[PDB]
Amino acid sequence: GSVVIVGRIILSSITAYSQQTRGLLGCIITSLTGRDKNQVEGEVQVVSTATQSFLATCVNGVCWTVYHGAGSKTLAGPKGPITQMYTNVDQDLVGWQAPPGARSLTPCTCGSSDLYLVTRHADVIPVRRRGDSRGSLLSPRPVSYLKGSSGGPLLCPSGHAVGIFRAAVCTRGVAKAVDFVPVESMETTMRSPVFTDNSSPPAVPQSFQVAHLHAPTGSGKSTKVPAAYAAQGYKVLVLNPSVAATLGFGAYMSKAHGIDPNIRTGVRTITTGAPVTYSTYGKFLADGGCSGGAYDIIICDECHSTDSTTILGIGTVLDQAETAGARLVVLATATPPGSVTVPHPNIEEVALSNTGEIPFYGKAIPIEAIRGGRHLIFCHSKKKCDELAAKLSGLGINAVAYYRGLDVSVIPTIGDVVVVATDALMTGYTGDFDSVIDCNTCVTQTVDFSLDPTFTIETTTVPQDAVSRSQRRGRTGRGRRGIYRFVTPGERPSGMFDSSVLCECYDAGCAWYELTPAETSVRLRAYLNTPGLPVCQDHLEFWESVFTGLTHIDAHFLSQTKQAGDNFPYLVAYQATVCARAQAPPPSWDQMWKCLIRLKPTLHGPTPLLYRLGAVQNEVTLTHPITKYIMACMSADLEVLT
Amino acid sequence: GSVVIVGRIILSGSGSITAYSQQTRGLLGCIITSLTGRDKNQVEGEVQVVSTATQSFLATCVNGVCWTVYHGAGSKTLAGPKGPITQMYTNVDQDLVGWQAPPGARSLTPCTCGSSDLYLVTRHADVIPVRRRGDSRGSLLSPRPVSYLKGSSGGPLLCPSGHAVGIFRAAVCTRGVAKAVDFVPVESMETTMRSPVFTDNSSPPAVPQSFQVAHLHAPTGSGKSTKVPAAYAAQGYKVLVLNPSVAATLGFGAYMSKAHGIDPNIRTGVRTITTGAPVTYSTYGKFLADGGCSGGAYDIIICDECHSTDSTTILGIGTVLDQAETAGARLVVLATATPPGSVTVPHPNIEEVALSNTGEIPFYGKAIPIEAIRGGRHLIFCHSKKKCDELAAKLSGLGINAVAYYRGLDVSVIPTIGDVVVVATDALMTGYTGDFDSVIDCNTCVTQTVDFSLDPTFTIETTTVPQDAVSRSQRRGRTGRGRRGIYRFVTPGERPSGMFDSSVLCECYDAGCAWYELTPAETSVRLRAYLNTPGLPVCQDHLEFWESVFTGLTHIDAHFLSQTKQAGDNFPYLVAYQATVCARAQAPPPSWDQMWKCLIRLKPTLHGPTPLLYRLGAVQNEVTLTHPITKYIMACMSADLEVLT
């Protein structure tokens, strides 16, 4: 639904009190109708979605708030839902046209060094400015003190707006300074295009440039356009996250545009001498990155993907391309950050109900819907894929499960089938289906700086974002009339990724691509600094510090964790090395720790724990030098969500 | 707010046990039904998925009764087809409540097998194998992190035939990992069903021939502290009357002599009088400081306001329950207007008025008009000392006699007498005894909770929370006694009464060590008697954990301890113990909050990281974890703990 105004902070010799204008039932109704006829007052609003509550500040006729709170959502209004006027993901900033009633603040022009921050609990916290977007609290406070107050005003002594609060800067869970969105970033935003055109490939510039191509799969973004560029005599590299897609372009480009391209993947390499090459990001990274002068144009396809190989891959291109003699990088995707799922003309969307013989995430699928034909059911976990595949088989429906680890010949490719899959589908298999049935949830990893003793990487199930919905749905409708069936109608905001993904990049750097933490950092820096890409919290220096301390890994353990293909094979193998040399057992005996299975007869005592990568069942000791090193890294200044 | 059926978990009735869920309601549906308490929907299956506004859990129908946990449902009604269904059973001691199964629900039936192979059904329709250890415990065949079990309290444990062994109430964790499950055995449900649904506790018990413990549930001004001790005295019994507050204790004693003709013994820190009479009024605090029950002194002990879950009251009541029989008492009366499971009911003499946004004085997002308080005697409850002062300032500047009250102030600041507005915390109700024209209530308070945070050990978080039914009724009770009274409020909500946090148990050991020269083991015996006595407020059983922690905190510095004591802050033992550890290391305290003011004078000598034992607030200093006491407490964290699920 829409974001809803649930209260306001009135400003007065500076002071504030809060007024709550709506309760829970009123907030929910108004969020669904998008229709709000209440009187609107003040300069600071207290807003809320169904999940999260936070602040918005009106400046120059615009009610501004944080992207991480509001996403791309409408605001409920006197004449129905209000589409965002401005949406700037790079800056964590959105704006609606302020409705009648709202008074705006004026920008602090002159510029104070002593600022005051207004929280959702009407405190006025004094702040000394340091940078353009940072200020320090004169009195350090706990982090929970500032939660719920993102998008609140940062005010100079006269009461003019300096910026809006976006994030707390913490040292060991204690807020000490604040990142805000400066009022000049807002002004820049009010002057940036109504709608840039990104549905048309760039002309190749005389000097280096970075360009954005927004258009759907099979618009020739990865086929037609490299071929046009090649006809003009340019050498082009197309990068893709998928081995299956990458191999497919070979025979397709031969048949369709009479080019027999170079193909580069972990599983299969083809060198023809063509002026077009298709590679995975992963094989690109294993080849050492950008060859000297081999490519004029590098096309980074599916640049929406926020897996660690794609992010490190694209970062490597953005750090190297210019120096290597390229003239053009192209960031290509259908679902750029900030996007929302639009209705698709060739796809009928229909909610599941509780009528049907097959239960599914609290709803039902009727046997008739999937009895014959070819259908794709998306589930969040491997476990659920096996359960559902087995139920379907019990009823005589031809059905098969697919996820990370299975070979993709579990298919079939032709004839009736229900494929029950995780999102591993979206990189392992190219085919389209008569219908897609979507659970509307995924499994993600999140980092938790839990100081017990260090940090924790949690696996968590979450509601899908708009990229997932649009990509999952796009497995029906490619030149066929499709049907998308779903469990729930919403989608969280697109284009954000967790700090665990940064951690994964360093980890793959060490594990696979022979990168030092410093090299990895430089490349991620390049990605982060480039606008239009997915956004994260800047935790580069913290992660670099951590991995920088993890030396003399055991090559054999590393080889095993890589071979087994699970996540964070460096961190896992590093913990195992520490355990084996300390002659101590691992955190538990889960499959995760199988590199250590043969040593089990002699391993004893408490586990020298570095960090938590799942359930820790053994007793722990914190005496290991490496643990002390990582605990010391936790003193880093960390941006946290607010 | 009613509890609402938002879905069901369907169990297979053949082959091996399997489950699946169905959702019957969205968020909005849920909220509206909770408000109206009226539920159109056909209900099916035996396991229901239920929700309040603040949480979701399970309920299992067994023998025509839909059962769930008290920590989830409190005393709330269930939204049904012809409106709200009130609980048929509210067994707070067993963490068990039940409503009559609505029409359409099937019911499980108990196990006749007596089998030891058990299966737990969760809210995600998983069927977890479990082995039975005792009547109420069962171990997981394979440990799991605690969070996959959350939201599944009230769900069933089945035998291989698919009949009911019990309902899931808590995970037993070792350092954040569940090894076993606490459940409510189907016998406890069987008992309950065969026994009465109503019991009377509204009248003072008869004095029995031999030792008995009895409950007295009756309003304030039914003479529970005055009439009933007077009445027992006049039959020739010796009577001790224990109360949490010095003020209330002195108030009653002077009332006794004026009104009932007895000059009683008084026993408080500030005033102690030995008249030889057969009735004695005392605080729980003075009682404990006197060493408890002295033999042959009393026939009858009245533990008044036995709903208080302050550590001195709990320890006081525990001491009495362990000692009274042997000290030769015949009767212990546990007396309260507001016993566990109680609800705030409409009062005849008091008008209850929602606060609006119409008004000139902001108050917790709402408004107070000056009309409402411009003349007369009025009381405003605020949650913090730091909003009591800021609100009384805004009142004073508006031509108003505003006076703040809170812990750490003299009660003589309250005009007796005068035409006044008092702005105060819950400190009021132990400090002052007068009543008012109206009360205005923010419906929130500051509590403490323990987090088994493992960073490195535990954390005592101070937090703000919605008031419970006790706080509501007690706060409202300061007007409407025998005359007009107005109750104005910000929120109509109200949490379940009678539960208290594990932090309170920690306070009990702390106070034992700091005030009453009890070793942790002595303390455990007293608490054990409290927990084991039916009808009193309830908590999780974390006795061995806490005893084991305080058993290691030896050789505290006497001087620091005396200072944390005198300054009246909470956890004076834990605060002084951290400070002692810090000074003997020449290390600074975790921060320079007033909590650590005993170390301020040593500031010039203190350097390096703090050897952190635990967390009692924010930690600004770098910390080290090598102190042996830190290791001891870390060792104590391997204790097997119930956590809420």
Ligand SMILES: CC[C@@H]([NH2+][C@@H](C)CC(N)=O)c1ccc(Cl)c(Oc2ccccc2)c1F
């Ligand atoms: C305004 C800072 C920007 N981060 C920079 C490092 C640039 C970048 N490439 O991300 C930023 C923009 C938008 C958001 Cl939602 C930010 O915060 C989060 C919070 C949680 C997860 C992901 C991003 C953010 F941190």
Ligand SMILES: CC[C@@H]([NH2+][C@@H](C)CC(N)=O)c1ccc(Cl)c(Oc2ccccc2)c1F
């Ligand atoms: C059935 C266990 C019982 N506890 C025993 C130690 C008896 C007692 N005296 O409390 C119990 C009853 C009711 C509830 Cl809400 C329980 O759980 C909580 C959970 C959190 C806070 C307080 C009690 C409970 F743990």
